[PDB]
Design a protein around this ligand. Structure first.
Ligand SMILES: CC(C)(O)[C@@H]1CCCN1c1ncnc2[nH]ccc12
Length: 167
């Protein structure tokens, strides 16, 4: 039993809700919140910009030190950093950005990072400003993640389409 509330159950391990991931994290304080990161950990917009803003830019300061030490992530890769005031940890995961010409096949690799964590709050990888089809991202999530994932979908209209079209 966990403290996630109001989710629709899609499969044995995947749950979905129309919600702002920032407000969800602040309420639940999950062990792991997933960020929709880029390889530079430059948290400018979308989920990343919103999460970072909610940390008063502390996420960006920590991220800049991480990059200065380690260099950029790989597309499809991840790193674990602090969750600041939002969660214990933030798993920064880089899905392919179609608006940069990146290979959508890397979306499965991106979701594989979730399997290293028993329970996560997360957005749909590569959706929104990353330019992929959210229906496809949900399918890849369900077919790749085996741990317990609670998906927050910001746009109510998109949420209804994801639910109604889910196979
Ligand atoms: C599918 C996406 C890209 O993840 C959705 C579609 C709109 C934005 N986005 C978000 N989802 C959850 N929490 C969020 N907080 C700020 C933005 C945001």
């Amino acid at each position: 039993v966990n403290s996630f509330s109001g989710y629709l159950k899609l499969t044995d391990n995947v749950y979905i809700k129309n919600a702002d991931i920032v407000e969800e994290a602040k309420k639940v304080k999950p062990t792991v919140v997933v960020n929709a990161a880029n390889v530079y950990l430059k948290h400018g917009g979308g989920v990343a910009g919103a999460l970072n803003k909610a940390t008063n830019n502390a996420m960006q300061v920590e991220s800049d030190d991480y990059i200065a030490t380690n260099g950029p992530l790989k597309v499809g890769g991840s790193c674990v950093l602090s969750g600041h005031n939002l969660a214990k940890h933030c798993l920064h995961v880089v899905g392919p950005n179609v608006n940069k010409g990146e290979d959508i096949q890397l979306l499965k690799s991106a979701y594989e990072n979730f399997n290293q964590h028993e329970v996560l709050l997360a957005p749909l990888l590569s959706a929104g400003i990353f330019g992929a089809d959210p229906i496809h991202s949900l399918r890849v999530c369900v077919d790749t993640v085996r741990t317990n994932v609670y998906l927050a979908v910001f746009d109510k209209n998109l949420y209804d389409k994801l639910v109604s079209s889910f196979l």
